[PDB]
Amino acid sequence: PLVLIGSGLSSEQQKMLSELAVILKAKKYTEFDSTVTHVVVPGDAVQSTLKCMLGILNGCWILKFEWVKACLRRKVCEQEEKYEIPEGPRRSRLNREQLLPKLFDGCYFYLWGTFKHHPKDNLIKLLTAGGGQILSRKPKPDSDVTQTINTVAYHARPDSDQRFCTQYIIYEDLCNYHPERVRQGKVWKAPSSWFIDCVMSFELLPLDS
């Protein structure tokens, strides 16, 4: 059961996607949800949008619009792999096909302070879609909740500190804040750009190394 959505597509391109969905006996959404299977972008790059990033975290096909043109011209569902955006999207799709944990499984996040460039609610949607859990109180390395969390992060290397230091205080960068150190106890301080870069590459990126 296919469910198509466009991200960054022109009006003409959206019309073609709608026409393709009919031919494929698929649905075409305009709002993302977890039943989406195919996200179509206009060119060779993942768009830096909530839809594309939710598509990555769901393991969707992220495909160049040439796939749509080829499907309509040849009147078949062309094989997705030839049109897939490489790196993050493919790594995530393969991750989902192998039934592996989501990118931020085992990780906990506290969204600290003001967010002007990345609406906080978008970060919450993303980290939740990626298997992360929200902390409602700021972690203090010397406190009750943060000393009792003992999860592991599947997408960290087993020998890295991110394997077992799985709590993240997220702050908005480009706002003149620089933590003295990136980690205190089990708690990292990470900029919102780190979070975005993780999703776009489908990697739990290091904050030190």
The torsion angles phi and psi of 86, rounded to 5 degrees, stand at -75, 175
Query: For residues 76-94, b (16+ Cβ closer than 10 Å) or e, as one string?
Result: ebbeeeebbbeebbbebbe
Two tokens, residue 58: 């769901």
Overall resolution, Å? 1.9
Strands 61-64 and 27-28: unpaired
Please state the three-class secondary structure of the chain as a single string. CCEEEECCCCHHHHHHHHHHHHHCCCEECCCCCCCCCEEEECCCCCCCCHHHHHHHHCCCEEEECHHHHHHHHHCCCCCHHHHECCCHHHHHHHHHHCCCCCCCCCCEEEECCCCCCCCHHHHHHHHHHCCCEECCCCCCCCCHHHHHCCCCCCCCCCCCHHHCCCEEEEECCCCCCCCCCCEECCEEEEEHHHHHHHHHHCCCCCCCC
Angle between helices 50-57 and 88-97 (to 10 degrees): 40
